[PDB]
Symmetry: C3
Subunit: 335 residues, 3 copies
């Protein structure tokens, strides 16, 4: 719980109303009750603000005349919402102290205030920085290093020789450092190429659940600082992702792709490897990326949904588009 005046100071917002109001939590506009702070970004909600029962609403200056409660005025209500949600966060920690059921190699190096959940398994040579939290059931493999403040939720798998920076967060079910998909061929028989590169994850990286980031073949798979990666993503061996890039859910990246900084990869895209994407590229959902991208901007692919009856005809005609092209050329030749 926090006083509205104090909250507004920490958010650098201008208070309009009783600064003695006690705020206990954040809520959506429709769910907010007495004691909740909420926010609005879309002007369509201005008109029924009198129906919102929050104790305070974060809004812009042009929103103030419509306010029907205490208001915090800011330039960017969505960013201010992020900040106040952090102040008022109710999310528990993955673990507290070291659990008696955790299995920790005696050669592990642990910083101060490290927490390790029940039945986690820490291999030899592992280094956990100050304030690192390892959730229940995790595995951290030989000689891996996790920087100060980083946290793994329950049932995360980190392989050997992995480096993770400071203040990272990895959601459950994710696997960092599995073998890349590397094989030679000896007369139709696959020959395993041991994958002895690593994964290097920078600072302030957030990785979702059931995502996989393979280790490099010789040199490393690299995730830059400030990168966010959603659930169900595959990052193949020797991918390099530049700082602050965002990868939405279900994206598949093939080996040796290089993505620049400040990119935004839409959900379920497929990005082929051994190529580069420059800084500040957006690929919309399900994008089929077959070629290098050398200019910033938004790129898209795919023929979207139609009623099945229409789709049958669309797909049949497209599959015969070479015959359509030949017919058009013949008609030109004749005319």
């Amino acid at each position: 719980s926090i006083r509205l005046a104090d909250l507004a100071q920490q958010l650098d917002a201008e208070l309009h109303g009783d600064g003695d109001i006690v705020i206990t939590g954040v809520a959506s506009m429709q769910s907010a009750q007495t004691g909740h702070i909420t926010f609005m970004v879309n002007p369509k909600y201005r008109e029924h603000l009198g129906l919102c029962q929050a104790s305070a609403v974060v809004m812009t200056q042009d929103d103030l005349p419509f306010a029907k409660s205490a208001a915090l005025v800011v330039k960017n209500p969505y960013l201010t919402y992020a900040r106040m949600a952090q102040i008022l966060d109710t999310t528990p920690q993955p673990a507290q102290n070291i659990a008696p059921s955790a299995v920790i190699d005696a050669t592990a190096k642990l910083g101060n205030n490290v927490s390790i959940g029940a039945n986690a398994v820490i291999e030899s040579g592992v280094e956990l920085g100050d304030n690192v939290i390892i959730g229940a059931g995790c595995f951290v493999g030989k000689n891996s290093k996790i920087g100060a403040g980083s946290r793994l939720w329950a049932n995360v798998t980190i392989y050997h020789e992995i480096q993770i920076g400071q203040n990272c967060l990895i959601q459950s079910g994710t696997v960092v450092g599995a073998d890349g998909f590397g094989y030679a061929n000896d007369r139709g028989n696959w020959v395993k190429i041991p994958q002895i590169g690593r994964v290097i994850i920078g600072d302030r990286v957030e990785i979702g659940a059931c995502t996989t980031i393979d280790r490099g073949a010789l040199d490393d798979t690299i995730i830059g600082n400030g990168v966010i990666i959603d659930n169900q993503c595959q990052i193949a061996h020797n991918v390099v992702i530049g700082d602050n890039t965002a990868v939405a859910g279900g994206v598949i990246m093939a080996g040796s792709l290089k993505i620049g900084r400040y990119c935004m990869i839409g959900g379920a895209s497929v990005i082929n490897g051994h190529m580069e994407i420059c800084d500040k590229v957006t690929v919309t959902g399900m994008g089929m990326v077959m070629r290098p991208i050398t200019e910033p901007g938004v790129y898209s692919s795919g023929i979207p949904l139609q009623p099945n009856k229409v789709w049958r005809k669309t797909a049949a005609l497209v599959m015969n588009i070479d015959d359509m092209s030949k017919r058009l050329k013949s008609l030109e030749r004749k005319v």
Copy 2:
């Protein structure tokens, strides 16, 4: 467990034709069935083949009966009867039995009657497990989550905090329920985390396949209706709502704040945009690219399917240059007119 054919027929509401004292030990396919097995026929093309089936009994329709070469259970719907007799004769083990000494259970967790928790599972403070709940080995159930009576988690399932799961659900291994939604604000190119303090509410009789992820909501909740079935490796983003009885096939990716109605069927590997709605009674065929809201019931499809590579190269290049093709068509129309 073995059962007399007469008793099985009564529990299945089937008409017995043959020896009621035959002992049935299990269910098998028609081609694999051996003595002691019961099987079923749905395709009358196999009538002439029944003499090759070594099952002790065969489920079939009244129209099939004259072709039987075994004891027969006559029913209106052999497939549904098959589902029912396979449940009666199910050989699937339970994920756990009793409470394992290696399980780690907070003293404040509330266990109902006949709860089983497998080896090395971890149950946080405040968790409530209803009567007959089974938690498989190596699971994690986070603080204050609640799992309704008769629900079962296979091994290595992760439930975060404040999750609500209904009665008689079944969740396969590797599934993660309640991870943070993908919520971030952008500050001059840097991502600022938005804590995800909503929940997941899963209804009654929900089945979730392996390595599916259902994220918790940002403020309000991600909601899965009753009777929903979800296959493997689906992503259900924060604040998605899925209506009762909807089926989601394998590998479907949903963006945040999608609402799917009741009675929908979403084909495998489909991709669905967020912040929009799909109405009731919609079927999306496999690999559907769902970019826009769906406002009328019915069947919807997308995608240009496989061709020989040499052919595909021309299809792809021509489609990519279809604007030029369109302009050439228009120009030729003007010249001819």
Copy 3:
């Protein structure tokens, strides 16, 4: 781990040019290699660059040898020799060693010789682990499953009940073998679960990537042939059959009752529908949408690639309206045919 260059050369059947007493400690890329490392060259464009490489030895071909600025191992196939030498010098640790005290092992489980079981792994009743099997930390192996000699599971792999895994397999973390297939009947609008009492049978020398799911069959079995390699995040549905030596790249989804032949190559993120067959020696390129059986060997492809968004908007609009284009073309043809 370390080995004299002469001994390494013999084991690789390579011709040594240089000092056989050099001690090799590991493999590295050309750019990262330092004293003690062996590396390899496959691209002759780097001949002029070998003077910048600080490896103790470089694997190359006879045609490369005049360009060497180091001890050289001459072979016919530097890439294959690289794979073999990386195995000889492999630094990958084992998933476990010995039987961990925190593992929970049913009294009826049967273990071969030199089995290792990692911390907090859980082994159900009736399980049989062959000689030299390694089960990683936190794994689950369900009732009556059998894992053949030499096979290894990394940490946090889930094997359900009645699963059979052959010899010398390797399964990466987060993978789930034997979950229920997606089987349900319909009772007046209510889903009715169909128990999935088939199994999964995995052959010898199968490698399966991370967070891959392979479901058990409904009555008969899901089958993975020998020598199959499967990447991360793949989904193999109930009753799929995959033939020997087929490769499946990452994020591939296969629907129920698909049969894939031998020596196939399925590109990443492909979607393969079920109740159909793909013959031997078929390559499906990445993101392929497979809706129909494939009866002839060769290379097959689908998908319309990326364009700038403003261009894609016009492409998509025109394609979605292609029936009108087809009608206009037919009408124009009739006019030109004087009809």
